[PDB]
């Protein structure tokens, strides 16, 4: 029913993804992450759990070439279920892309600082803890 | 997880609902409706069916006082399931509000013209046909 | 090499196509068409023939659902080779879309007026005559 | 009579609260506090005492999840009545929120510097001395 | 405590009043009135009843020279108490101004149209019905 | 004749005075002072001597609560008449305000730097030398 | 003491005069004239009587070539002293310019409508009645 | 077919070239280069390989006086065919200009940093690796 | 000495010319013409007679393809020397363009109205009367 | 013919000169000088030699009070004829101003840095080398 072919329908998300170059980053975050004013805010949160973190990550990565992902170390202990789903998804993504997506971890404080350098933060409705990822653009 | 208490979390939706006065309109539309440039565009559409038309209508009407809804005539025959889900929702809403929500139908052509006068169009990921409603703000005195 | 998957790489074209609704129009024009200030100008012209009219039409239609195309009557006599190439392309596009693209003709003067209502005019490097088309967004339901 | 359900009716206050993330701050101030140009100015002051500092704090905290509050040390000695009323209110808020709101004190000079980092300063009509608080967003 | 001498403390209200010329209008409205986009929106509403319609009218008229007031005919029957309070206040204002303030009534529909031509609409927290007035600037 | 009651009639001056908080500064300057772009420019200068430095200082201080004033050292020797008229005015102002206005002096070079931090510079038509003052907002608690 | 040679010192007035072409108009008005938003507002009013209407007209006409002036008919009866001073000044101006300045009169209502088409309205501190003129740019 | 005489038809390119002074830089880049926000973005990329890096470099240099070019060292080993075509083109350009165009190499990391100081980056559709050049404006005088 | 090759050096002129399409107009005017706010203002006037009307017309027409020119009837009687110099110049221009430039006349009142529809007015320092021309973009095709 | 009396007819030049205070600078430059984006760009260049550097300096100084001028040391050897013309002009200007204009020299690299602090750079059509000057506003008291 959209006039745009494909599945990435949001106008802002389409626009920012089409502006990305190598090493530019894009953040997908949860309903409580602060968003620095040095970065564009794309607020997709409708209500609790809608859309979910994974729904957004999944849709964004259909159009974005990802070479790396950064996470808060706190996700491992405090949201292991979501951590594992994300890792599985990034594993499938890299296979589809024909590359290898590098995963790394920093403290959440440091994560928030890195968000200041992204091209945009896409806010989801996710309510679970530390459901935030920085995606880095890259191709082989 | 959010810093705003309640369930209407979107910043633009909150902002526009808080600016509404009596008889101001807000449109919730499907993935294919054109949006006139005389109106603000709030693009919630992520992908096909996410978020749905009903998810957006429901969330919006938790904060918005609704006195009327306008629909395309075309929805009756071409999307009867969604039509009846929306009518049921508006029926519950009016009860919770303590009023009676007036429903009307115009041609889709005329509907699109009315959208030019709204304060904003909130775009959903809905892909079914004629999944568009104009909500009118109002309360009992 | 581009960070966007697919083949529609231009940021402004991607942006306008993602904002299109049903019956919105998008114009692809040649190097000499005047562009009204009521419409956004996406200037893809690099130099004579680069990119060609057909390159731009082809790329735009890989993302945009097209239900109709409008052309100046003058193209039939004054640019028949390009006219046919475009018709063949629209024939294949409708097949891949699963619909039927309606083609219509107006005077060039009328065509220029219709461009004032489009969302954007994407300017190619094409130098042949009347190499301009208005594409209308639409899908079947 | 308003078209928005609830009691937080101001359009600008609604807007900024809806934009808050964890650790973002919002300031509620008196009629005399300077407002840095690195922050948004929401001027609610109508006239002396209208609306009061407490009326604004109260209304803001109906929508905002508060995890901490910062005050000038000067409030203790120079506006003890208002100091107490605020502490009692924050006590009731934390109970309603199911958390514990941390209170801390800085010099007024330092307080003014922290206001430079807030998302907005909401100016009240309060005329008593040092009737200024920085509220920090947070949940569990 | 404010740095501006007097009692009209709001920065936006001060600003618009200082821009008024003869026959320019300023609207003071209730919490439910729609505000046309051809006019500036000064949103003073904090919460239900704060500030009241009368508090705003009173404060605005301390700085503004008023020669006329326009009301919806609906106020007469549906908010007679507020109607009277306003007429008494306008009576005292004209005495203090040394002029005579003309009052007239239009349909609410027509009232809303006239608001499109005003310099600003100052929104109060008033919840009673038809608590809206158009004030017209003028002196002798 | 004006629609604003009182005697501070300028729209920009009214606007900026109403935005002032404690320790914010406002500068009233002469016809030749440079105005940094980090500060708002309110240009009241019509022609030589119109309005005068004192006319502007006087009007501004009818609405502004002043707790301090800063001057160039150079004003003492090079514009002593104006210096003493200003000191007299500040003396009356403090009495009417019920406080005590603190006066200080810096080099003109340093004065210009301090103007970079003010909320606005109100430019007068004054042509005498070093007819510039930084006024600091403040009241007694 | 100004860096600009000559006597027209205001930055906005200098700017608008330098943009004028033949038949463009510029209004000088009193402290109470409403100023339409279709026109630029240059607010020179400091306080009652400062600067005066004549001070502004006089300064503006040192840089502006004037071919015509329009006045409200009401000036003749209600501000004859100022009317005559203005006429005398326009008489001297035309002699200096080597042309003949055309004077015409319309109703004040019509005058206000004509102000909507000017390039700018320069507001003086004048408090006497109908102290408003539309100046038309022109040279022989 | 265009209203501008000559062969540099793009309005943004024409505009930026006409604002260049001596030592100003202009970047022509491939489809994958990040573009810093301290620089203007001129997005000519339509689709993969259209227009090519060389098409853009060639057209730009028909209006722009070039005194030097900077490349990433990585181009030597990872895009040698394109490297050579560019050097040949710069050789012919310097001859038609009557000067000598200086070529230098930096790491790609350092190249990206230099792009932050250019007046604009013109993005081509090129997909080969390290197809990025910083062109420096200058004339013999 | 400039970084742009050729002789049309102004950045705004270069910019506007590169955006012209067929039938777009560009005005070159004298020091006294009013410029409507519906049109871009390019102020080249430095002082009386610098640059002259003819200097501007000449430079503009080196980049701009002209198909027609409109003048005020008043130029015939009140600036005949300039009228003739312009016609001669348009005669030589059409020869170098290989077309025929149509000249027409309207009242000056009507001329001013047409200027409201141009893409820009380029103001020269010319002081002679009615030294104003509307140039229409076009090429033979 | 112009509606402004006097000889400084350009709207942007008039505007910037009227905003100058003591020690603010204004640059007049040649056709090749790069203009930093921290400064306003007033592009008076029409074509080679039009207007000349001296035309622009002369006109600017009819309105602007000048207390000092800064030049690149390179002008002495590489443009001695223009250097002398400028010095003679500054000699007459100071006489008519009743002051003494201080002239100083820096490296051209340093000159370019100083331009970043000016209020505006007014670009002439001058093609000779190092035809750039920084003028400093000031009057005697």
Swiss-Prot record, chains A, D, E, G:
Function: Catalyzes the interconversion of beta-pyran and beta-furan forms of D-ribose.
Pathway: Carbohydrate metabolism; D-ribose degradation; D-ribose 5-phosphate from beta-D-ribopyranose: step 1/2
UniProt record, GO biological process: D-ribose catabolic process
Subunit record text: Homodecamer.
Protein name as annotated: D-ribose pyranase
Enzyme Commission designation: 5.4.99.62
Amino acids binding substrate: 30, 108, 130-132
Reactions listed under catalytic activity: beta-D-ribopyranose = beta-D-ribofuranose
The entry's keywords: Carbohydrate metabolism, Cytoplasm, Isomerase
Organism name: Salmonella typhimurium (strain LT2 / SGSC1412 / ATCC 700720)
Catalytic residues as annotated in Swiss-Prot or TrEMBL: 22 (proton donor)
Subcellular location: Cytoplasm
GO cellular component: cytosol
Main location: cytoplasm
Gene: rbsD
Single GO molecular function: D-ribose pyranase activity
InterPro entries attached to this UniProt entry: D-ribose_pyranase (IPR023064), RbsD-like_sf (IPR023750), RbsD_FucU (IPR007721)
Family: Belongs to the RbsD / FucU family. RbsD subfamily.
Class in the EC hierarchy, top level: isomerase
Pfam families: RbsD_FucU
């Amino acid at each position: 029913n959209a006039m745009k072919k494909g599945t990435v329908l949001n106008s802002e998300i389409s626009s920012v993804i089409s502006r990305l170059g190598h090493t530019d980053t894009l953040v997908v975050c949860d309903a409580g992450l602060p968003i620095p004013n040095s970065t564009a805010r794309i607020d997709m949160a409708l209500t609790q759990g809608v859309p979910s973190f994974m729904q957004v990550v999944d849709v964004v990565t259909r159009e974005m070439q990802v070479e790396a992902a950064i996470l808060a170390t706190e996700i491992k202990q405090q949201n292991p279920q979501l951590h594992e789903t994300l890792l599985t998804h990034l594993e499938q993504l890299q296979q589809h892309q024909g590359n290898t997506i590098k995963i790394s971890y920093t403290t959440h404080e440091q994560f928030k600082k890195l968000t200041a350098d992204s091209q945009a933060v896409i806010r989801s409705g996710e309510c679970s803890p530390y459901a935030n990822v920085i995606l880095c653009a890259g191709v082989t």
